[PDB]
Amino acid sequence: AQRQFFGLTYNFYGQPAPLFDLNDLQELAGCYARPWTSRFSHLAISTGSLPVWSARYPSVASRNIIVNTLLGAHLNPFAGGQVTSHQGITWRDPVLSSLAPVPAIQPPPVWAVAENVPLDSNNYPTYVLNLSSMWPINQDVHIMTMWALSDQGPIYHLEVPVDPMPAATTAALMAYIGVPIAHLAQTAYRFAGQLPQSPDSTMVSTIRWLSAIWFGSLTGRLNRSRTCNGFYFEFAKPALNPDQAVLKWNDGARAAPPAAAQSSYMRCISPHWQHQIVEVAGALMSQSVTAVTGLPALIDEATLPAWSQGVANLTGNGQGVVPCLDYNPVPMAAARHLQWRQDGLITAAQEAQLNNDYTAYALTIERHLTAMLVANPIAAGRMPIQPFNAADFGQAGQTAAAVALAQAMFV
């Protein structure tokens, strides 16, 4: 199993302190006052399809964002090698089971406030000793890092080998027929969460393919007329249940393997993701794979924000540096619709209607978020939602390159 990890904390958007309050620290959905393995606790039991959000957690991404900010204040052991306290709260034990008020016996030193501190598990030797019980820290820290590096949307990884899907993985995949993406993400999160796993594992490679397949269907390159290995994702009309994409197996044609190995990093370049479940689900699922196996290679700095330029174990500009692509959902949907009519699944009249429906749907997302931002100004003290500008909803980004990659990926 992977015995070392690296990470990076969040960046204060000009504010002087991490953006959370004690109540946020008090109302986590999991076990009391523990951040680990909690990113899905708020929807383990569900009814209906309506997104879950509340007054002080007003977006589907809000809870996870808060958690990331929260962790940024207490991860000192992986930077300074010691446990510290902030505003009179610290960990119960060196195993970091949960947070608690500081005891009045041996108060640990007060944490010095800073941002974007690089992290290395080797600074804290006890983690190696207690790996069997501290394993979930590995997954969560990696998740936090993968979000901290971006100013606009979480970063995640894609790859497809030259060989066909190995038989062992196919045996596992049939267990996940007809399950929506969100459920799959929750399952993927739990798998890499509880116990340490080897990078070489049937389950790991299974999820890796799942990530690739979903992206291929996302562009519409994969559909019921062109499957990966019989697998593909089925979509509902965006006018209603716009997110209930599920996995299907089919007996039809299969896309041929790529000429060479393909791999890249992906990102959403528009604020839409903060209130769109499928982006969160896809990002987390891919990130879960990278968590257990580590980063295949450094990320290209060229398109990243300022604080992300040249992170020690994360970003670079040398030779073995995988580029990162980013896209906007609206043009992506248009391309997906275009693929469908080209493959003949739909007629052009339907394609025009689908674009109108989706654009209207996306408009509500923007309208909701922009109204929600002013209701929770970042200067208040906590950041339930990430700041943005109105123009960010119109950026096309590298969407053209994205669909080009998928076409080169599944062929």
Binding site: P196, S201, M203
Partner: protein, 49 residues
């Protein structure tokens, strides 16, 4: 095979001997014994954590 994990077969235990050929094989020299001597221990029982 010490350290591996194997199933129980509580309903009728005689299946236990059949389920995992090779484990605890006598070093006698018989045709089946000679064959079973070539089994690889890592492929007994479950494979994953």
């Amino acid at each position: 095979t010490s350290g591996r994990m194997i199933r129980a077969f509580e309903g009728r235990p005689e299946l236990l001997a059949l389920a995992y050929p090779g484990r605890a094989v006598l070093p006698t020299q018989t045709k089946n014994a000679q064959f079973l001597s070539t089994a690889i221990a890592d492929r007994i029982g479950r494979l994953d954590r």
